[PDB]
Point group: C2
Chain length 297, copies 2
Amino acid sequence: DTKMDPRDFLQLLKINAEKAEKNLPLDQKRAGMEALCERFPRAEGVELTLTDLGGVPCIRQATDGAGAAHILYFHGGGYISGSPSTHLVLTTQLAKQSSATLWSLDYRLAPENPFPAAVDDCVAAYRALLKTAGSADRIIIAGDSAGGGLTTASMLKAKEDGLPMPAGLVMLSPFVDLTLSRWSNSNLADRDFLAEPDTLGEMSELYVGGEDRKNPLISPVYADLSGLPEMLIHVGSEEALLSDSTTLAERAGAAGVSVELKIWPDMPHVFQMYGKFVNAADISIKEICHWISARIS
Amino acid sequence: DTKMDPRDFLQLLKINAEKAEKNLPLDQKRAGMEALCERFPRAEGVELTLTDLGGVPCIRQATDGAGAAHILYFHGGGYISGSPSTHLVLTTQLAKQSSATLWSLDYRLAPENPFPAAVDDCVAAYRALLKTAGSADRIIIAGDSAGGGLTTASMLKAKEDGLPMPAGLVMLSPFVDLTLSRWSNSNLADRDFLAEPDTLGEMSELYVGGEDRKNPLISPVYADLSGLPEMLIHVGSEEALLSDSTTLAERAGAAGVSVELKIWPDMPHVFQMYGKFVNAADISIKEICHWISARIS
């Protein structure tokens, strides 16, 4: 089974970023993702049911053998784009390999629904999943990029709303500091062909709206993370957002949260989307599934 | 069998910190670390051979049942104290649970011998261990506090000098930024009743002494960390030097080094010393050994 050399795959990404249409209308940018991400391979045997959680739509994903494990999954794409469909590549492999039922949430997006819309849908969805699952102990919250951020932030809100914390949190290249100001944002920008460093400002500004970027529910790095459940963070080396993950780990760590972080050589932003090309991607996926399933009881 | 609640063990550490003499003579501090440490249990069946690696004294440690893996260990103590004997408690466990032969180096201390003495000793030992082990791929380099600093530093020098790289680096609460300036240094100071933030300043001067605190071989956080082998870092929440772990992870990952970092809730500096008292120490040791004994293949 054939793979790119990680470095050659960065060269492919570099080309893609170079040729990117600079001011792509957001609605065209969204259809472009839907169209490309459709040609990525879905995990065989994983069925997809179109449905809802607390009346927020989601695509539910499982084989014919799923145990009683559950994953609440929040796709990424900077709060302004992405949907469950784009992230099937990834979410169906997590479902299949965990033997869990994954619920991939279609949270309201910005700019048409600014913060706190997405955070509200996430908490609303978890509320409902507890009913369906029966216990918090059987739920992992999981997400990439903006969704990795949502995975902490929704859990900070739910805890304040008095809901029971779930079994663990999985973040892939979390986006958790929208000040965009730490070491990696200056020092690795030139290495990140996916994150959109040069625009992330207004990427974020659409979702932020009027709010404070250090609002703890916008940027969970500034929050009070105490009481949160076990975290697992995977981030690639080639990331403008690397310091978001080392900072999250630092601040959560200091708040008494168990934290496992793993940084992958030569991998780009949310490299787990690209198993077709790089073997690290499947290894990360498989590590994620081992962890999910070890502690979901 | 019996363990303390981690928060209770922290209170026991607070009390020792409160009621310790303000300026003990360093020969007495060393003598008294020695006397207290003889009290902690050592793994049953671990034979203690007094030997050398390339002229540097060491205690070699192993069971009768040991495979062909070697662990080259550097103890902590601020570059000014500690010894293979004081760490028997920790290293005999590393040896037994990893089926390895561990060589706990008696590298040279300061202020008798300042930077670069301990580094050249570590390198010399490694060089010598390459011949005894027959291959770099059966060696792990491990170490705590300054032992952790030197496990990085020694390999940077080993790399400069053209020596192959080992199968991996393990670091327990590594001391890797002698500038002492980062977030945990001030935030978490008062929660740290082992690393002794208030003295660490002038303590470590004995090692540096005229040298620059950002010498890559003194504070590897400032190094070109390219081409170093895979890293496993463990550390506790209650650590003035927590940002050493997260920061080394930042920079090592961005230099393209594999890095896995776990941070342990309510654990103090080098908690793996306290299996007798807290349960998380036995678990961390267990995981470290799994890590170790799975790179050897």
